[PDB]
Each structure stands twice: as C-alpha cells, then as structure tokens.
Write a structure and sequence with these properties.
Belongs to the apolipoprotein A1/A4/E family. This is Apolipoprotein A-I. With 46 residues, the protein is mainly alpha-helical. The chain has a single domain, classed as Single alpha-helices involved in coiled-coils or other helix-helix interfaces, CATH 1.20.5.20. It has helices at residues 7-10, 14-21, 33-40. It starts with 6 loop residues before the first helix and ends in a 6-residue tail after the last helix.
C-alpha cells in the first residue's frame, strides 16, 4: 500500500453498511481503554 487509492472508493459505501452493525457498540468499550491510556500520559498517582 505505497499508494493505491482506487480500491478504497470501491468499498467506501460498504463502510456505511459496516456502521449499521456496530451502531450499539460505540459506548461500551472506552473506559476500559482509559486505563492503559493512563499509563501512557499521567493522572493516577503522579
């Protein structure tokens, strides 16, 4: 994938199809990701 932006367009509307599945998934995993993200930055015992 050095530069191929032809195929992306093929599957551009299919990405719409894809969201419809994971409609109810957005707000379930993120606070779980907000624990390791803690290690990276700060906030949590200096």
């Amino acid at each position: 994938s050095p530069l191929g932006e032809e195929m992306r367009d093929r599957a551009r509307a299919h990405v719409d199809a894809l969201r419809t599945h994971l409609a109810p998934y957005s707000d379930e995993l993120r606070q779980r990701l907000a624990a390791r993200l803690e290690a990276l930055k700060e906030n949590g015992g200096a």
